[PDB]
Write a protein that binds this ligand. Structure first.
Ligand SMILES: NCCCCCC(=O)N[C@H]1Cc2ccccc2/C1=C\c1ccc2c(c1C(=O)O)OCO2
Ligand SMILES: NCCCCCC(=O)N[C@H]1Cc2ccccc2/C1=C\c1ccc2c(c1C(=O)O)OCO2
Ligand SMILES: [Cl-]
Ligand SMILES: [Cl-]
Lengths: 146, 146
């Protein structure tokens, strides 16, 4: 549980927002990319795994699950790559709710930033600090595990 | 102490590697940028502060300390922007040692990656996982503070 992350891909302004959610805490990292490719996903996962102890990733779709580049990154970083099938159906709705929430925050900050990527990082900040906070929960969870 | 970070800028392959070090743990985040500008530094700090509880940043030079864009980002993210003058002289040497270590790791992985940015993120991963590890220390420090 402390090492479980879920990938999530959402769209805004003709661009793609790639999100990793730490399932147990709701803590997120996110980036804007031109389109979701195996290459982009692989690089994103490498970044994530260097920063937090990522044991398992539930991939966001079958293309990323199949991607040899994503598989290479998961091998390199010691990540167990799994499907993201919502066997528990309240998963769908929670990811949906998070995308809606993130887009709302992005709209609330959008005019403070020239570029979407900046607004997305502002949204990450607000989400992870919002009150415990998600940032507090992830640290506590991992510390307890260690 | 749990909230103190130090910026560090080093060079490789005609490119710039921007590093943030969590002083109490040795944990790092890093990115490759074409050149160190206020814009790049500001964006990097926004990303960092959304991901960890960044209270104080010791800036890497006077240009970034002066930059209105960096000041704007620090204001936005609630970061106290400070100078990075090594009042304690063992700071210089520790940062110097870290840059040497990072470049060594980059060389050890460089052939596994087409692009420098990938090698740098591999180096971040190896550095933060190397055995406690820096990743374990930062989590414990912050958890104790919370
Ligand atoms: N629509 C009006 C926009 C006017 C811009 C106002 C303004 O200075 N924003 C600051 C606030 C702020 C808070 C935190 C971080 C950046 C920024 C800002 C700019 C900025 C800086 C670097 C970047 C950026 C942008 C960006 O602006 O996105 O993009 C990638 O690297
Ligand atoms: N001697 C040359 C080696 C040829 C490449 C070998 C190879 O497949 N590396 C994997 C291993 C690996 C481990 C972790 C993450 C990426 C990669 C790799 C590629 C890669 C993927 C996405 C990217 C990249 C690269 C990149 O290659 O940098 O760049 C930005 O997004
Ligand atoms: Cl946080
Ligand atoms: Cl780690």
């Amino acid at each position: 549980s402390p090492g479980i992350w879920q990938l999530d891909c959402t769209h805004l302004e003709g661009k793609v927002i790639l999100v990793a959610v730490h399932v147990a805490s709701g803590y997120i990292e996110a980036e804007v990319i031109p389109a979701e490719t195996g290459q982009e996903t692989a690089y994103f996962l490498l970044k994530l795994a260097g920063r937090w102890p990522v044991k398992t990733v539930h991939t966001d779709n079958g293309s990323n699950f199949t991607s040899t580049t994503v598989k290479a990154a998961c091998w390199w970083a010691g990540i167990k790559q799994e499907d993201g099938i919502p066997y528990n159906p309240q998963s769908q709705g929670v990811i949906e709710s998070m995308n809606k929430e993130l887009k709302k925050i992005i709209g609330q900050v959008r005019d403070q930033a020239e570029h979407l990527k900046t607004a997305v990082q502002m949204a990450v900040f607000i989400h992870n600090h919002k009150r415990y906070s998600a940032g507090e929960r992830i640290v506590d969870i991992i510390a307890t595990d260690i």
